[PDB]
Scaffold this active site. Sequence first.
Site, PDB file in Angstrom:
ATOM      1  N   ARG A  44       0.847  -1.216   0.063  1.00 16.31           N
ATOM      2  CA  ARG A  44      -0.030  -0.066   0.014  1.00 16.31           C
ATOM      3  C   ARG A  44       0.949   1.181   0.018  1.00 16.31           C
ATOM      4  NH1 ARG A  44      -4.837  -1.946   0.778  1.00 16.31           N
ATOM      5  NH2 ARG A  44      -4.934  -4.048   1.730  1.00 16.31           N
ATOM      6  N   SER A 127       7.036  -7.264   2.606  1.00 16.24           N
ATOM      7  CA  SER A 127       5.652  -7.648   2.210  1.00 16.24           C
ATOM      8  C   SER A 127       5.764  -7.793   0.691  1.00 16.24           C
ATOM      9  CB  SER A 127       4.655  -6.472   2.549  1.00 16.24           C
ATOM     10  OG  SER A 127       3.381  -6.832   2.202  1.00 16.24           O
ATOM     11  N   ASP A 155       7.231 -17.454  -3.441  1.00 13.83           N
ATOM     12  CA  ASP A 155       7.149 -18.434  -4.535  1.00 13.83           C
ATOM     13  C   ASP A 155       5.682 -17.936  -4.915  1.00 13.83           C
ATOM     14  OD1 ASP A 155       5.356 -19.129  -2.091  1.00 13.83           O
ATOM     15  OD2 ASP A 155       5.538 -21.084  -2.717  1.00 13.83           O
ATOM     16  N   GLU A 231       1.362 -13.108   8.263  1.00 12.48           N
ATOM     17  CA  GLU A 231       2.645 -13.507   8.630  1.00 12.48           C
ATOM     18  C   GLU A 231       2.600 -14.962   8.633  1.00 12.48           C
ATOM     19  OE1 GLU A 231       4.313 -11.099   8.315  1.00 12.48           O
ATOM     20  OE2 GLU A 231       6.491 -11.807   9.164  1.00 12.48           O
ATOM     21  N   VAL A 234       2.567 -16.236   4.586  1.00 10.27           N
ATOM     22  CA  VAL A 234       3.523 -16.362   3.833  1.00 10.27           C
ATOM     23  C   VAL A 234       5.025 -16.826   4.429  1.00 10.27           C
ATOM     24  CG1 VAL A 234       2.721 -13.970   2.943  1.00 10.27           C
ATOM     25  CG2 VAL A 234       4.363 -13.928   4.929  1.00 10.27           C
ATOM     26  N   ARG A 235       4.788 -17.353   5.660  1.00  8.10           N
ATOM     27  CA  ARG A 235       6.103 -17.947   6.441  1.00  8.10           C
ATOM     28  C   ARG A 235       6.432 -19.322   5.579  1.00  8.10           C
ATOM     29  NH1 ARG A 235       8.253 -20.826  10.985  1.00  8.10           N
ATOM     30  NH2 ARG A 235       9.948 -19.514  12.007  1.00  8.10           N
ATOM     31  N   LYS A 240      10.531 -22.674   2.657  1.00 10.99           N
ATOM     32  CA  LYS A 240      10.801 -23.270   1.332  1.00 10.99           C
ATOM     33  C   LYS A 240      11.979 -22.603   0.691  1.00 10.99           C
ATOM     34  CE  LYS A 240       6.904 -23.500  -1.283  1.00 10.99           C
ATOM     35  NZ  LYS A 240       5.900 -24.220  -2.351  1.00 10.99           N
ATOM     36  N   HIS A 263       2.780  -9.264  10.424  1.00 10.12           N
ATOM     37  CA  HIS A 263       2.756  -8.509   9.414  1.00 10.12           C
ATOM     38  C   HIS A 263       2.301  -6.819   9.673  1.00 10.12           C
ATOM     39  CE1 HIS A 263       3.435  -9.613   5.195  1.00 10.12           C
ATOM     40  NE2 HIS A 263       2.759  -8.544   4.752  1.00 10.12           N
ATOM     41  N   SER A 264       3.460  -6.325  10.327  1.00 15.78           N
ATOM     42  CA  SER A 264       3.212  -5.042  10.399  1.00 15.78           C
ATOM     43  C   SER A 264       4.946  -4.191  10.768  1.00 15.78           C
ATOM     44  CB  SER A 264       2.372  -4.755  12.112  1.00 15.78           C
ATOM     45  OG  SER A 264       3.079  -5.479  12.973  1.00 15.78           O
TER      46      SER A 264
END
EC number: 2.3.1.122
Length: 288
Positions: A44, A127, A155, A231, A234-235, A240, A263-264
């Site tokens: 954003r 992000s 990914d 968070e 996407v971890r 991976k 996620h901040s």
Amino acid sequence: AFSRPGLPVEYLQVPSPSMGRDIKVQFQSGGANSPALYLLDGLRAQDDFSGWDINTPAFEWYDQSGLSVVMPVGGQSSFYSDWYQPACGKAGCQTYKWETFLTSELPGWLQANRHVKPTGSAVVGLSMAASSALTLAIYHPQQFVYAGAMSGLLDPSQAMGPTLIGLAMGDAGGYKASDMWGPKEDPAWQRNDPLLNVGKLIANNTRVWVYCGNGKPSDLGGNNLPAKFLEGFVRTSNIKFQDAYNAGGGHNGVFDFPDSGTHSWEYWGAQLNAMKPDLQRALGATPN
């Protein structure tokens, strides 16, 4: 132009031929011919200031570090990429050619007008910008010898990443993912997928710093469901990536996957501060 008398932070209007306009850029010189640190904004990104300056003491932390801090401004949902189609959102369309701007226009302009070394730079993103940073280093190793990825979807071309990125892009400015990299089967997707191109980071021996929280907030904050779920979500891609990097013979990476963080910005800032000394050493920074 300087934002205030007595402080080194500048706001710049860097022309972008590829995008047919001037890109605003917050800047702080680390001295003549000093290495550059590119800080990429999140999904954003606003057009007034970079999330890095809005939410962190970045400039203040890096003042006199011997590193030139570069904060481009704008590009919501851009993924700092060169789009196929115009970037059309709720607020009209624009030309998005961020890879071009970041890999030639900006460097050149900073070398000529602010004496910033055009190569041997670091690019750190969070992000959305997290995979962008890895990707930029993969295709421009001479320019970016160091890439930082905080809480990113590493990914993006795998599983449901295309759909999820589209949902994100639609909610942040109302853009369309296909306008950027086209339909899911378009080559652009696996080209901009860091996990799939990790072999290049290894071959080039790029300094890699990947960070990601587990979804559980700490005293730092960011305690809200969305920040926690993202968070945690996407971890997986981050693990991976670590496994691929390691399996492939990578030997110049740092992986920080603590048992906390959401996620901040509170977490991304703390992390950027934590990596200052590593950045100076790897880029050959000369303090003051």
